[PDB]
Every structure is written in C-alpha cells, then in structure tokens.
Design a protein around this ligand. Structure first.
Ligand SMILES: CC1(C)CCC(C)(C)c2cc(C3(c4ccc(C(=O)[O-])cc4)OCCO3)ccc21
Ligand SMILES: CC1(C)CCC(C)(C)c2cc(C3(c4ccc(C(=O)[O-])cc4)OCCO3)ccc21
Lengths: 224, 11, 212, 11
C-alpha cells in the first residue's frame, strides 16, 4: 500500500464524516430533506476526492468527469454504511433519521428498500469497516469506463492500485475470511443498479418542479 | 460547464 | 463442489435491419441459455421457482457476456450466434450506436485486452446467475452460498493459471458493474422496441419481456 | 405465467 495507502483512504473517510452533534441537534417533506442532504454532501464529496491519493494529480477535466460519473453511487455508499449504526432507516448527513414508513408514504419505498436490503443489511452483516468502505468508494471514483477521460489508462492504473491495497488489507485484517475481498467487490453491481434507479427518481422530482433542489445538486442533474 | 464543481476542484 | 471444469463444460456444450437480426439471435440463445444453466453445478437442485427467478433476472447480462466474449476477434463489431456479423456502422445506422459502442468499449475490448479465457467467462456468468439479491427467492442464502463457491473456485483458477497476474481475479469481478449497467440499458431498448411495434420479436424473447 | 421457461426447465 505504498502508492495507494489504505491509511490515507481511511483518513479521507473520517475527514468528511458527519459529526455526532449534528444528529443530537434534532431528535417535514422526506424527499425535500433527503435532497437537501444530497446537496450538502456533494460539497464534502469534492473534499473527500481531493484526499484520495493521486486524484488531484489527474487533469482537472478528468477529475470533473469522474465526480460527475460517480457522485450518485459514491453518496449512496456513504449513507448506506453510515446507517448500519441504526436498526432501521437511513441517517442523513443533516442529522435527520428517515424511517421506512416515511419513505413509503413519500412514494419512494421500493428504492429505499433496495438500499436497506442490498447495501445496508449486507454491510452490517459482514461488519464492513470504514477502511473497506473507503476503498470501495475509491474504486467507484476511479472509473476508467467514464466517457471523455483524457487519460483512462491512468484512472485504470489508480483503480488497480486501490483494489490491490484493499485485498492486502483484507488478507491481513481478516485472515480467517478468504472470500471477504470478493464479497466486498460483489456489492458494486448492486450499487450501480441502485444508483441508476435513484437518478431516475431525481430526474422525476426535478421534472415535476415540486421539490426544492439546491444549486450543486441541480448542476449535477443538468447535462454537461 | 459545471461552474460549481470546477470552482471547488480548482480552489 | 464447484469445479471450474464443469463450468467450462457448460460453456462449450452450448457454444454455437441489424436490430431484427440481433433480436432473432437473442431469441435463439434464450433456449440455449436454459440448457447452459442446467449444466452449472447445483443450479438444477434449486427449487423450480427460484430457477425461474434467477434466469428472468439475469438473462440480459448472461447473453451479453456470451456474445461479447465470442466477438473478441471481431474488429469494430460483434458476432451473432446465428453466424451474422454486425459492424459498428450498421448499428449506428440502425439507431442503436450508443449502446452498441458501450458493449464494444466496456466489454469486448476489455475482454480482449486481458485475454479473458472461456473458464473465466463461464465463472463470471455463473456468478451473475447465482444472484442472491434477486427478488422473490425462497432461499437467498443457498444462492449466496453457490455464488461464493463459484468465486472461490474462480480465484483459485486465476492464481494457478495466471500466477504472474495477482490482480486478475479482481479485474474480472470489476467488469460486472459495467455488465449490469449495459444489461439494464439493453432491456430498456427492448421494451421500447416492443412499445413502438416496429421490430419483430419472437415468442421466447417476448415472454421474457412480459411482465411478472 | 411463463409457459416456455417453465417447460424447458422442468421437462
Ligand atoms: C430519490 C430519493 C429521494 C430516493 C431514496 C434515496 C434514499 C435512495 C435517495 C438518495 C439520494 C442521495 C443522497 C441522500 C442522502 C445523502 C446523505 O445524507 O449523505 C447523500 C445523498 O443523493 C443521490 C444518491 O443518494 C437522493 C435522493 C433519494
Ligand atoms: C437493443 C440491441 C438491439 C442493442 C445492441 C445489443 C447488441 C446490446 C443488443 C443485445 C441483445 C441481446 C443478444 C444479442 C445477441 C445474442 C447473440 O448473438 O448471442 C444474444 C443476445 O439480447 C439481450 C441482451 O443481449 C438484444 C438487443 C440488443
């Protein structure tokens, strides 16, 4: 993990983690609050990316492409892992706790359930730790398939560096679990599918014009 | 052209 | 319990308007898809209802993986199971150039660059088949166990066959998110073709597109 | 529900 230290990736994760006081300070439209949280987190996502080894060394236009291509999955991965701390629902970065009943009444119960079943429950069952989550997110970030990349080979090289470090980390931290590395990578297709379905919901909310959408989220939703 | 994102990355 | 030799055998035993030809090949390959699944260790032991769920859930991805690997020697195009070759230009003139290019760039070209072999392709398809997240499964734990056995066998195969390439196993697994995305987009195109009613669609393909 | 798929699997 010399060129891609897991210690640095963990550091990046901890650096943008919502504070305990934010949750304490609190405990009405569910979708509006969720979208507000997403906008807030888009700013911290940029901060997080800059802390991932070598991301800032990529040409600016490629940094832009990678973040536009992966913000949806990157944010879902983040709040999903954050939510293993509660028995049900999801904890928003704004401190609010959204329960299943609220999601269903709001009309987004199916995708909310997919997140809880395919991501949250699986992360909690295997006790995915923050270092592992951080590496999976970095892998998602370094997506060499993103169209428009000036140097996709370098992004591909960076991704390979991350999964090499992640495998070494898993082998050392959990020697008793040989298939843990594969198990982690195999949550990525589910994350991809869920991210695509979430985007479909966001475009609908935007199209209706009923939901307040802040500046950064709006920019991410508007074509290049 | 992704005004906000560019400003945040360059900053 | 999940020998790579059996997976390789399942792959070989089934081994064979541009849109109309492609849809004709897809219908043809659905029949062989079922026979392939039956040859995958332990699939036929699962309850019938779960076998149906797994195939209706992964058929798009399963078929795309198969023709993509078959097209590794093709230049700027794909080789259909019917023997017909479809070039990039033909796809573009038919109005499906975007998804066609994703398949060539994210799948075919990637498989060619790393020289993915038939055993590895078989294992990835087996992993796709045993999808424990499929809704409605009566025993998701059993399907999860079968998937774990496949990637355990796949990793062992990679470490034995390609000892000089430590990251090969991960490289293989990381083509699955792209396959998932392309499969979803392809399904969308098929639904659209059906809606318009401009493209012929055979009985088996039609059934797969029929709501639950 | 799925005449074709069921038959191929069963028989
Ligand atoms: C569409 C809607 C309301 C459906 C349900 C879920 C919870 C998946 C969801 C998630 C998002 C979100 C998101 C939500 C919360 C957070 C957070 O609190 O960290 C950050 C991002 O934005 C983009 C990706 O995920 C946006 C909208 C929706
Ligand atoms: C939508 C359209 C025409 C766009 C281009 C691609 C090649 C992706 C495509 C793929 C399919 C196919 C398919 C195509 C070819 C074969 C074959 O030759 O083995 C078997 C299956 O069906 C289901 C999945 O993949 C169907 C339609 C399309």
């Amino acid at each position: 993990n010399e060129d891609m230290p897991v210690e640095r990736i963990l550091e990046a994760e901890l650096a943008v983690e919502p504070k305990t006081e934010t949750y304490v300070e609190a405990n009405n439209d569910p979708v509006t609050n969720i979208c507000q949280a997403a906008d807030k987190q888009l700013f911290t996502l940029v901060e997080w990316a800059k802390r991932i080894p070598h991301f800032s060394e990529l040409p600016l236009d490629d940094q832009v492409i990678l973040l536009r291509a992966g913000w949806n999955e990157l944010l879902i991965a983040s709040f999903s892992h954050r939510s293993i701390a509660v028995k049900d629902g999801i904890l928003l970065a704004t401190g609010l706790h959204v329960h299943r009943n609220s999601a269903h009444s709001a009309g987004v119960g199916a995708i909310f359930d997919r997140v809880l079943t395919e991501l949250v429950s699986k992360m909690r069952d295997m006790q995915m730790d923050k270092t592992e989550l951080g590496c999976l997110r970095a892998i998602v970030l370094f997506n060499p398939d993103s169209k428009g990349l000036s140097n996709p080979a370098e992004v591909e090289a960076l991704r390979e560096k991350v999964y090499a470090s992640l495998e070494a980390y898993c082998k050392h931290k959990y020697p008793e679990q040989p298939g843990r590395f594969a198990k982690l990578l195999l949550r990525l297709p589910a994350l991809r599918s869920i991210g695509l379905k979430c985007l479909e919901h966001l475009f609908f909310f935007k199209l209706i014009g009923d939901t307040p959408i802040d500046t950064f989220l709006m920019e991410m939703l508007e074509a290049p | 052209k992704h005004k906000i994102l560019h400003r945040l990355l360059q900053d």
